[PDB]
Design a protein around this nucleic acid. Structure first.
Lengths: 166, 176
DNA sequence: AGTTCTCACGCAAT
DNA sequence: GGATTGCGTGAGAACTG
């Protein structure tokens, strides 16, 4: 019976997930555990530790794409579901290449290893091949201009960027 | 019938597509147990089950978006140092005062209008862009202090927008 | 006819 | 009537035309 004692926990974390009730339960079993890990890290987006001795969502529509070092995403714009034909939760934690072109995968990989503390190049800017939803041609060349940061096994390089069309 | 239909694509092909399902959750379980600080300090075995049973704690302790405005605000402010400013149609008087205005407190943005915080050289590049549903322009706002060029741009099937009275421009600012 | 998957109870391992 | 991670396959949704 213990093999069922988990779903009692999953339905919790699923309901304990910050998303609308309309399509809340649409999350698969690995989707919740995927989103269950892509949110707690947000808790420590900036400071959840202490060892060292609203309605502000108008900018998202007037345009934020987060990236990590292990080749996967940390947070997708809360408005990246209208300028792009997909949803946030669908790829809010999966690898970035799953949405980037083939020959262009090597470009994003080089923006972190050969790039890297506010100095050349703290803020980069370039184009690339992105995926599209279909009333579309399947790819878009957005202008990713990122501002490298040290988001917090010591800390590694993060990327706080905002991509826009061409 | 079981030559390549059950052995090469029934078990083998499946075993490759159903074994990772158990390795990713354990990964996430191990990937999730670490984030939970109240689960790593256990006698050489964080229990892979309590990794989720107690994980509900932080899942409980901590609707619109899983992130908070102060996060996104600090997020966008960390993204490209973007602050939100809402001025009037032509009045010029700023409506909103952004808390990440670190390009300079509200002394100049409270009473003085946006034109006061930019350079007078914007005689036209600051009025024509005012009242394409969205405007794109790079005005010359000052606050040495005169070289912070800020490139601003702002404004399914939905007609209006049930919200406060906002007939004016709401854009951002980033050093470009 | 079609398909990939998610989800289900059942099995030999500690 | 007793419990741990983990290995199969199939009943069936759900994205496949």
């Amino acid at each position: 019976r213990h093999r069922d004692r988990l779903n009692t926990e999953l339905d919790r974390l699923a309901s304990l997930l910050p998303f609308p009730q309309d399509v809340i339960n649409k999350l698969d079993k690995l989707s919740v555990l995927r989103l269950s890990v892509s949110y707690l890290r947000a808790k420590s987006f900036f400071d959840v530790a202490l060892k060292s001795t609203q309605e502000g969502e108008f900018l998202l529509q007037a345009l934020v794409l987060v990236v990590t070092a292990d080749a996967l995403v940390f947070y997708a714009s809360s408005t990246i579901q209208d300028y792009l034909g997909f949803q946030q939760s669908d790829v809010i934690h999966q690898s970035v290449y799953e949405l980037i072109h083939t020959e262009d995968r090597a470009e994003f990989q080089r923006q972190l290893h050969w790039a890297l503390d506010q100095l050349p190049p703290e803020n980069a800017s370039f184009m690339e091949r992105c995926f599209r939803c279909d009333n579309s041609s399947g790819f878009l060349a957005m202008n990713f201009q990122g501002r490298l940061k040290y988001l917090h096994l010591p800390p590694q390089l993060a990327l706080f960027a905002i991509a826009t069309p061409l | 019938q079981s030559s390549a239909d059950k052995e090469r694509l029934a078990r083998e092909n499946h075993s490759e597509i159903e074994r990772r399902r158990r390795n990713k959750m354990t990964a996430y379980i191990t990937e999730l147990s670490d984030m939970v600080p109240t689960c790593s300090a256990l006698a050489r075995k964080p229990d892979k089950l309590t990794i989720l049973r107690m994980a509900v704690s932080h899942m409980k302790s901590l609707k619109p978006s899983f992130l908070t405005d102060q996060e996104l605000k600090h997020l966008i402010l960390e993204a490209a140092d973007g602050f939100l400013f809402i001025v009037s149609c032509e009045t010029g008087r700023v409506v909103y005062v952004s808390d990440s205005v670190t390009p300079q407190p509200q002394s100049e943005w409270f009473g003085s209008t946006l034109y006061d915080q930019v350079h007078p050289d914007d005689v036209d590049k600051l009025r024509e862009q005012l009242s394409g549903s969205r405007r794109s322009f790079i005005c010359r706002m000052r606050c040495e202090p005169h070289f912070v060029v800020v490139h601003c741009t702002g404004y399914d099937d939905d007609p209006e927008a049930g919200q406060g009275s906002k007939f004016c421009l709401v854009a951002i600012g980033r050093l470009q």
